[PDB]
Structure formats: C-alpha cells, structure tokens
C-alpha cells in the first residue's frame, strides 16, 4: 500500500526524452519519430521500482499479472584468499621465531684470554599472533510469510537459496575487507617502509617514474645479501621474486597497459616485476601500491560453522554463519608502501633488544634503527621511564640498572621532527625486566 | 641549448631552434624542434 507513486521516483531528469523527440527537426531524434509507441516505451522502459496494479487494456476490472520472476544470483569472491595459510583448529596463539645475523668481532688474542666463555646471546625476535576475528552472520527466513510473494514453489525454493547465498557472500567480502584492513592498519602504525613517489594518473611521466621505483625496489628486496631496510623489526630478510605480490589498484593496471606496455617493444622490461593483484583501493590517504611477500599475510581460519534454529512462535528460521579467524601480519617480511603524498620524515624507531631481562645492577646495550624517509640523519634521544632513582641510560644506548631497582622498566629512543611549537616526536620502545639479585647491602657501594 | 627545467613544471616543452635565413621583414626562419616531456623530481 503506497497510494502515491510516480514512475520517476528517485529520478533526476536530464532532458525529458518524450518532449525531446516530438520537438525535434534535425535534432538526431528523428529516428525515434517513426516509432509508433515510443512514448509508452519512454515512460516505464527504464525499470519501475514500486509496482502498481495496472488494469488490463481490454477489460478494465481485470488486472495485469506478473508473468515472470527472475531471481538474480551473484557470487562474490575474495582475490586475497590465496594469501591465506590455512587453518588452526586447536590453540590460540601463533609464534613466529627469527634468528638474525651477528656482528663481526675483531681477532684480538690478548682480549680473548679471559673471554672464551663469554656467552653472547643470539639475536632472536619473537612475534605473537592471536585469534582476532570472531563474529557471525545472522539471517532470518520467514518461510511462511514469504509464501505470499510467490505463486510457484520453484521460485520460492530458489529465493530461499538466494538468501542463503547472501550469507556466504557476506563472508568473502568481509574476509576481503579484513585483509585490506591489515594493510591500512599496518600503514597507520607506520610499520610499512615508505617509498615516496609522485601520483600517477596525472601524467605519463609520473607513471614511468613509478615503474622505475617498482622494479628497483623489487630487485633491492630480492638481493642475495638481504637487507634490513624493509622490515618492521629490522632484520636481514632476503625475499624471492616468486614470493613478491603487488596489490596496486585497478587504476594503475589499465594505465600501465595503455601508456607504457602498449608502446613497449619488449614488454618484460617495462612491466611490474612481481605478481600483481588488483583491488578497489586502499582507504588510507596517500597510499597507492603495496609490495609484500606472501609471508606477510598470516590469515589462519579457526571456525566456519553454519548453525540453524527455528522459532515456532513466529514461524521464522535463523541462520548463523560463525566465522572465526586469525587476521594478522608478519613483521619479518618485506613490506613496501608506495606512498604518493607527503610523508613524515621518520615513520618508526626500531630498538633492537625489544625484550630485555637484565639483572639488578647490570647493563643492557640498545641499538636503535631510525626509519627515515630522507637523507637527513636524525639524532636519537635515549630515556628510561617507569623506574627508580639510580636507573640511567647513556646517549649511546647503554642502560645502567640501579642496585636498588625492582620495577619493570621501559626505555625510549625518541626522534623528533618538527619545531618546538609542534614538537612531533616519534619514539621507539623496549621493555626491560629486572629480576633481583643477591649479595648486597649496606652503604658505600 | 642547455635547457634548464626549474621544477614546478608540468607543461610539455617544445624546444625550438630557428635559423635566420633571410633579412629584415623577410626572416624565413628555418626551425627544427624537439618535444621535451617532464619527469618530476618528487
């Protein structure tokens, strides 16, 4: 019951094609002039939203019936489901473990006289993942209320299936969004390593420059000697060329074909150098392309269970599709952000012993890794918070825990950017525990 | 002929070179031209 419906509901008319035809002379509508019943075709021929009971053309008291019902059916998939790593049925934590390279010590035979049993610890960094996503897709079918919209069982049984298929399309869309959220999360954290570019689709020269920064970075990533420059934990990480995925957008694909790859005599010298996927676009401001390993994405399922129930008091069913999965990102893989706009100068400060457990009165050495986007060297300010009086730290990065320390510490490697009115300081951080000693007391120590 | 692009440059440059083969009010400038595109510098 809707009582006042025009055919043009929602419509903004451009030029009234009915009046535009009959008021034509040589206005290119003259081919629509010999159409006999065009003004009826121009009325409802763009689809009608709200139905209205149209009386029959011969006998007025009869109505015009629906003679065909088409139930359109879609299948939405995930491009990114090849980046998943499988399922984890039991347990909720994933433990990545990574030993890193050493630092070469000089041959010194006189120093080595006392240091044979030195016990230099290895450089292991750990990263823990967890089940994040835990949610369900609710739908309700009122199986007997929907029997009034149908006069055929073949369509009613097909419309019930379409409501079912909608639950599975809300899966593979939100799975696609939660993985794209992992890129926009990781960039808002500043954990991506930024390569500054210029925006393409403004000129060819902005695009050709971009392809030169594509193929250079993907070769810098897969150099055999590795690099520290492209991770979030700053470890030596070689990657391989077959493992490299490029998650650009649908704008750089067709522009590269037309402006560049069409006029290429040797297409393999101007194409992107890794695997290429195509998306709708990253919702972060300034982000265009992302170059990552497949080892970056860590998507482990945990549950996929469609459960039903029927309400007897009101005749509906309810269908619950529970999706539980682990949606996180490795900080050991090469992850390159191709960022167009302005960037901060330093995006991240990586202090190298992130987890330290030095003793009461001992020493921990700290090495910071400033992630600068420019050749300006930045001076690093060390500090230490959460502690007591005698805890101090050297401007080289050497902690000196007091003899009277019991608190869980935290050290900081501050790097500022802006001026004193807008101080703009990015800062790294490592957590130090104390674990009290023995053999102490008194005074003059 | 040392073309100097300044920066803040987005226009397709046609670098000309005319040779005066002629005279006053009959210059008959013979020109050959090179079309110069612009790669930005971030």
Please indicate whether, in this complex, the C-beta atoms of B10 and A203 are within 8 angstroms of each other.
yes
- Token code pair at residue A421: 């009115």
Of A196, A197, A205, the CB nearest to B39: A205
Q: Is A368 helix (H, G, I), strand (E, B) or coil?
A: strand
Q: In what order do the strands lie in the sheet with A335-339?
A: A193-196, A335-339, A287-293, A244-246, A275-276
Are the beta carbons of B40 and A196 separated by less than 8 Å?
A: no
Resolution of the entry in angstroms = 3.2
Asked whether the beta carbons of A230 and A240 are under 8 A apart, the reply is no
Which two three-digit tokens encode residue A68? 């065909």
The dihedral built from the CA positions of residue A10, A13, A16 and A17, taken in this order, carries a sign that is: negative
**Residue B12 touches chain A, beta carbons under 8 Å:** no
Which residues in chain B touch residue A203, judged by CB atoms under 8 angstroms apart?
10, 38, 40
Interacting residues of A53 by C-beta distance below 8 A, sequence separation 6+: A63, A64
Chain B hits for A339, CB-CB cut-off 8 Å, are none
Facing residue for B37 by CB, picked from A197, A198, A205: A205
Which residues of chain A are within 8 Å of residue B35 when distances are taken between CB atoms?
A: none
The pairing of strands B34-36 and B13-15 is antiparallel
Please tell me the distance from the alpha carbon of residue A8 to that of residue A17, in angstroms, as a whole number: 13
The answer to whether residue A209 neighbours chain B at the CB level (below 8 Å) is yes
Q: How many CA atoms lie within 13 A of A53 on its CB side?
A: 7
Closest chain A residue to B39 measured between Cα atoms? A205
Distance between B24 CA and the closest CA of chain A, angstroms? 41
Contact A205 B42 (CB under 8 A): no
Contacts B39 to A, Cβ<8 Å: 205, 208-209
Give the C-alpha distances (Å, rounded to integers) separating A256 from A340, A356, B42.
17, 48, 20
How many Å from the N-terminal Cα to the C-terminal Cα in chain A? 92
Strand order in the sheet with A425-432: A355-356, A425-432, A409-416, A381-385
A-chain residues near B12 (CB < 8 A) = none
CA distance A187 to A371: 13
- Cβ–Cβ gap A208/B42 under 8 Å: no
Rg (CA), chain A: 33
Residue A426 in 3-state DSSP? strand
Identify the residue whose tokens are 């055919």: A7
Q: Among A347, A142, A311, which residue's Cα sits nearest to residue A232?
A: A347
Calpha distance A415→A419 (Å, rounded): 12
Burial of A432 (0-12, 13-18, 19+ CB in 10 A): buried
The structure tokens listed for A371 are 């992630």
CB distance from B38 to chain A under 8 Å? yes
Using alpha carbons, select from A212, A230, A200, A194 the residue that is nearest to residue A342: A194
Using only the alpha carbons of chain B, give its radius of gyration: 15
Q: Name the nearest CA neighbour of A29 among A20, A37, A38.
A: A20
Q: What does the block give as tokens for A332? A: 């050991």
Q: How many CB atoms lie within 10 A of CB A72?
A: 5
- Partners of residue B10 in chain A, C-beta under 8 Å: 203
Q: Are A406 and A389 in contact (CB under 8 A)?
A: no
B7 inside 8 A of chain A by CB = no
Instruction: Report whether A351 contacts A428 (CB < 8 A).
Output: yes
Residue A413 CB partners (closer than 8 Å, separation 6+): A349, A351, A366, A368, A380, A381, A382, A397, A427, A428, A429
Closest to A196 (Cβ–Cβ): which among B10, B38, B42? B42
Of the residues A195, A201, A209, the best mutation for testing chain B's interface (the one with the most B CB atoms within 10 Å of its CB) is A209
Nearest to A210 by CA among A201, A222, A220, A219: A201
Distance from CA of A206 to the nearest CA of B (A): 6
Per CB-CB distance under 8 Å, the chain A contacts of B42 are 196-198
Rounded Cα distance between A206 and A137, Å, is 44
Q: For residue A139, how many other CB atoms are within 10 A of its CB?
A: 15
Using a CB-CB cut-off of 8 Å, the residues of chain B touching A209 are 39-40
Residues of B in contact with A204 (CB under 8 A): 37
How many beta-carbon pairs under 8 angstroms link A with B?
Answer: 16
> What is the rounded (10 degree) CA torsion for A158, A160, A163, A169?
-50
Please tell me whether residue A37 adopts helix, strand or coil conformation. Answer: coil
**Angular region, A180: left φ>0, alpha ψ -120 to 50, beta rest:** alpha
- Residue A49's SS3 state is coil
Exposed e or buried b per residue across A90-126, where buried means at least 16 C-beta atoms within 10 angstroms of its C-beta: eeeebebebebeeeeeeeeeeeeeeeeeeeeeeeebe
| Nearest CA-CA partner of A344 in A292, A291, A285, A412 | A285
A213, closest residue in chain B (CA to CA): B42
């Amino acid at each position: 019951t809707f009582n006042d419906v025009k055919t043009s509901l929602g419509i903004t008319e451009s030029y009234d094609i009915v009046n535009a035809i009959r008021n034509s002379q040589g206005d290119n509508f003259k081919s629509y002039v010999p159409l006999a019943t065009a003004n009826n075709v121009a009325e409802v021929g763009a689809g009608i939203l709200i139905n209205q009971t149209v009386q029959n053309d011969f006998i007025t008291s009869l109505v015009d019936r629906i003679g065909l019902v088409v139930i359109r059916q879609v299948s939405l998939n995930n491009p990114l489901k090849k980046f998943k790593k499988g399922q984890i049925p039991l347990g909720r934590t994933i433990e990545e473990i990574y030993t890193d390279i050493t630092k070469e010590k000089q041959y010194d035979a006189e120093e080595a006289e006392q240091k044979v049993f030195e016990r230099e610890m290895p450089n292991v960094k750990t990263l823990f993942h967890e089940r994040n996503r835990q949610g369900f897709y609710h739908q309700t079918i009122q199986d007997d209320s929907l029997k009034t919209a149908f006069v055929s069982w073949g369509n009613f049984e097909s419309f019930v299936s379409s409501i079912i298929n909608a639950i599975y399309n809300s899966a593979e869309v939100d799975e696609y969004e939660y993985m794209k959220l992992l890129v926009d999360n990781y960039y808002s954290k500043g954990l991506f390593t930024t390569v500054k570019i210029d925006e393409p689709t403004s000129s060819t020269g902005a695009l050709t420059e971009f392809v030169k920064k594509m193929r250079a970075t993907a070769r810098k990533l897969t150099l055999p000697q590795g690099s520290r420059d492209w991770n979030s934990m700053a470890v030596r990480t070689r990657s391989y060329m077959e493992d490299l995925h490029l998650i650009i957008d649908a704008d750089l694909e067709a522009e590269l074909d037309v402006d560049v790859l069409a006029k290429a005599f040797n297409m393999n010298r101007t194409d992107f150098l890794g695997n290429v996927t195509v998306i709708d676009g990253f919702a972060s401001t300034g982000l265009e392309a992302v170059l990552v390993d497949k080892d970056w994405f860590m998507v482990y399922d945990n549950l996929h269970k469609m459960e039903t129930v029927r309400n007897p008091r009101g005749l509906y069913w309810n269908y619950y599709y529970h999706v539980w999965q682990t949606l996180s990102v490795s900080r050991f893989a090469n992850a390159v952000a191709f960022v167009s706009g302005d960037v901060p100068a330093v995006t991240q400060v990586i202090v190298s012993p992130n987890i330290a457990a030095v003793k009461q009165g001992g020493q921990q050495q700290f090495t910071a890794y400033v992630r600068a986007t420019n050749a300006k060297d930045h001076k690093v300010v060390w500090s230490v918070e959460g502690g007591s009086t005698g805890t101090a730290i050297t401007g080289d990065g050497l902690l000196s825990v007091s003899g009277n320390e019991d608190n869980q510490l935290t050290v900081k490697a501050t790097v500022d950017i802006g001026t004193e009115d807008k101080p703009k300081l990015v800062v790294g951080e490592a957590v130090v525990s104390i674990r009290p000693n023995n053999a102490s007391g008194g005074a003059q120590a």
